[PDB]
Ligand binder design. Sequence first.
Ligand SMILES: C[C@H](O)CP(=O)(O)O
Ligand SMILES: C[C@H](O)CP(=O)(O)O
Ligand SMILES: C[C@H](O)CP(=O)(O)O
Ligand SMILES: C[C@H](O)CP(=O)(O)O
Ligand SMILES: [Mn+2]
Ligand SMILES: [Mn+2]
Ligand SMILES: [Mn+2]
Ligand SMILES: [Mn+2]
Lengths: 186, 186, 187, 186
Amino acid sequence: TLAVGKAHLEALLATRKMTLEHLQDVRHDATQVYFDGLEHLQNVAQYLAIPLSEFFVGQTQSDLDDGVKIARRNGGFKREEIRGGVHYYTYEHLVTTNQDPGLMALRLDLHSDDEQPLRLNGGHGSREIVYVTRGAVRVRWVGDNDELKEDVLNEGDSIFILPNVPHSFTNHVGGAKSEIIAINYG
Amino acid sequence: TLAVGKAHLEALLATRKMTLEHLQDVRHDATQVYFDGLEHLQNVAQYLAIPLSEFFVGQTQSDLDDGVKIARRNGGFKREEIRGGVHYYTYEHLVTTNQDPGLMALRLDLHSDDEQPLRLNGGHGSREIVYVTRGAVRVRWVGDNDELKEDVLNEGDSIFILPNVPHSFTNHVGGAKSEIIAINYG
Amino acid sequence: RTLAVGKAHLEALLATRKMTLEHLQDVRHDATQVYFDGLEHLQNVAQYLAIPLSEFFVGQTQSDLDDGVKIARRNGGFKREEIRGGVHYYTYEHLVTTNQDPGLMALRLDLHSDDEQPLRLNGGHGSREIVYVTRGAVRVRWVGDNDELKEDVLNEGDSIFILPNVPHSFTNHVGGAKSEIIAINYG
Amino acid sequence: TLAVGKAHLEALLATRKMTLEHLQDVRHDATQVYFDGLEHLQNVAQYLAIPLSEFFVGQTQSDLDDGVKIARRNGGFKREEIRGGVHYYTYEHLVTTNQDPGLMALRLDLHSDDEQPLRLNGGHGSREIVYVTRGAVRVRWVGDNDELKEDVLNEGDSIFILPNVPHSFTNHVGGAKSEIIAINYG
Ligand SMILES: C[C@H](O)CP(=O)(O)O
Ligand SMILES: C[C@H](O)CP(=O)(O)O
Ligand SMILES: C[C@H](O)CP(=O)(O)O
Ligand SMILES: C[C@H](O)CP(=O)(O)O
Ligand SMILES: [Mn+2]
Ligand SMILES: [Mn+2]
Ligand SMILES: [Mn+2]
Ligand SMILES: [Mn+2]
C-alpha cells in the first residue's frame, strides 16, 4: 500500500481535466489516495500520461527546521578517495538538504602531490567554487584546446570551475597537507 | 521488489560523492539495483538527502515511437463539462505524452452563450494559447483590478492567456456552436 | 547613444555584489533611471561587476499584454512563404506572439508539397512541437530510431507530438489537395 | 552604434521563422549586425516579440581563463558594513564571474556581538550556505511564525538558509573575532 497526497493527486488529475472519479478502483480518505503498490501507481501514471516521478515531486518532507539546516564538524558522511593507486582526497560532507539536492558542499583534505601521478577527474555538470582554508594547493585543469594548465592557490585564494572542466587539487609542497572547501551547485 | 536503473542510481550516488558500496544492503546486476520495496528506497533517499522523486526522474518508459507520438480524433479521453447546471464545454484530449506532462492540448466544443450565466474558471498555473477553428467565440476574463473584460474571436484568431488569469470561452452568437483548440504548456 | 537602465533594477544587481550606486561614481541618474554615456560605458560597468550585459535588461522589457492577455487576428501579423530546394513547402502564418513567452511560436501553416516533389526535411529544432490538423489529409515524415525514415498519415482532428531535434516534414497526402495544420512550438 | 553577433541574431530570427531579410534597413558584416542605437534594437525586439535581454544573452566575453577563474586573498572588492551605527561585517569578495552572475561568494569578518544591538537583514532571493573557518559564531534568524531563532556555530560547522529568511551572524564570545565563508547562489 502506497499513499499519495490527495490534493497533489487532484492537481495532477486537473492537468488532464480529470477528477478522482475518473480513476478506476482507488480508495481514498480526506487527505490521501491509496494504491495497491507501485505497479498500480505506475499504471495510473501511464493512464494519465504523466511520468511516475511527478506523483512524488514535492512530496518528500523538508529536512529544514524553521527555514534553515545546520551541520556539525564530523557529524555526517566522510570517505577516502583513491585514484589509480593514489590517495587523493578525504571528502567530508558539510550541510546537505533535500531542499536543494544539487548543492554538494565539501571539506577536503588533500593527500597527493607532484611525486604521485596526476589524477584528473572527467569534469562534472555542477559548477564549483573552491576556497583554500589551509596550506598551499596545486590546482591543475584542462583548458582551451585540451592544453593542461596549472596554478597555485594559497590560503584565502579561491577558484571557480566551469561545468565539465576536468580538474585536480593536490599539495603544492610534497608531504604538507592542505585543506579546501568546495561547493558544487546548480 | 523495486528495481532502479544502475547507471541512474550511480549518477545520483555520485552527486553525493558515493558509490554502490556505500549502500551495503542492496543487490544489483549489470543494469539494475534492487530494493525491498518502496519503504527501502525511501530510506536510501533520506540517507542521501535526495527526494524520492529523483530516483524516478527519467525512468518511466517513453511513450513515443521513434521520437513522435500520434493521436487520432476521438481516440482518447473525452468528457462533457457542466458548471452550475450549464453545459459549458466538451473536452477532447489531443495527443498526450509522458515526455511532457505539462503539455495539455485540447479540442473543445463550446455549448454556452449569453443566455446562460457566466462560468469562469479560477485560472491555472499553465500558460495557454487558444486558436479558433470554427465559428465565433466570446471570450471573457478577469483583467487588471479585477474588472471583467470581454472580446470576440473569429475563425483563425488566437489568444494568449497569462497564468492564473480566470477565463471563459462561449458562443458569441447563441445557438451557434463554435470550436477552439487550446494548448496549455510550461 | 545614451542607455538608460532602471534604477531599482540596477540597484538590485549592485546588491548582488554588496554594492550601491556610490561604487559607480561616473553615472548620472533620476528617481527611476540611471544613464550611461553609451554601450561601451555600460559594458565597462558590467565587467567591473562581473555580470554579463544581458542581465542589465532582464525583466526590463514592457509587457505586450493587455489585462493579462493578448489577441491576434487572422492575417493580422507576419506571414511568409517557405521554399526549400525550389519546392514550395509551407505558408507560415504567425498566430499570437508575445514577449512574455518568446519561446512560444504558434503557427498556422498551408501545405503546398506532396509525393511528386522531393522530400525537404528540416534538421529538427530545440522546441517541442505539437501539431493539429485543421483541414485535409497530411503526410508526416520524420527520422526515427537508428536514422530510419518513418511516415504516417494524419487526418482532420488528428495530432502529433514531436520530441526536440527530431527532423520532420509535413506535406499533402493526396497531391493537389491542400491541407492546413496548426503547429505550436514551445519550451 | 550597437553591434549584435550575426549567428546569434539569426538564431533569434529563426525562432520567429525569419531571416535577416525580414528586418528593415540593417547593415551587417560576415560576423556582426549593426543598429542605430538602443532605441533601434528595442524596436526590432518589439517587432520580434522577444525581450531585449535575449539579444545580449551569451554575448558578453567570458572572464574565465581556460575554463576557470582564480581570485587571490585581498585581490578584489572589499568593504566594511555598518548597520545602525554598529560595525557588523567586513565583506571580501571571493572569486566572481560573469559566467554565473547569481554566485556571490564572500569571506566575512564578524565585528558585532551580544553587547551591540541585533541587525538582521531582510533576507534575499539567493539560497545561502555558510561555513565557519574560525571562531564561534552566533547565528540568528526569523523562523516559522516570525519567531526569532538562534544557535551557535563552531569552527567547521555549516548552515543552509532558505531564500528570504532574514539572518545575522555575530561573535558568540564578544571581543573574539570570527571568520565565515558565505556562498549565495542560484
Ligand atoms: C575538489 C574537486 O573538485 C573534487 P572532485 O570533483 O574531483 O571530487
Ligand atoms: C479553454 C479553457 O482554457 C478551458 P478551461 O481552463 O476553463 O478548462
Ligand atoms: C510544421 C513544421 O514543424 C514546420 P518547420 O519546423 O519544418 O518550419
Ligand atoms: C553572511 C550574511 O549572509 C551576509 P548578508 O547577506 O547580511 O550581507
Ligand atoms: Mn570537482
Ligand atoms: Mn484554460
Ligand atoms: Mn517544426
Ligand atoms: Mn546573506
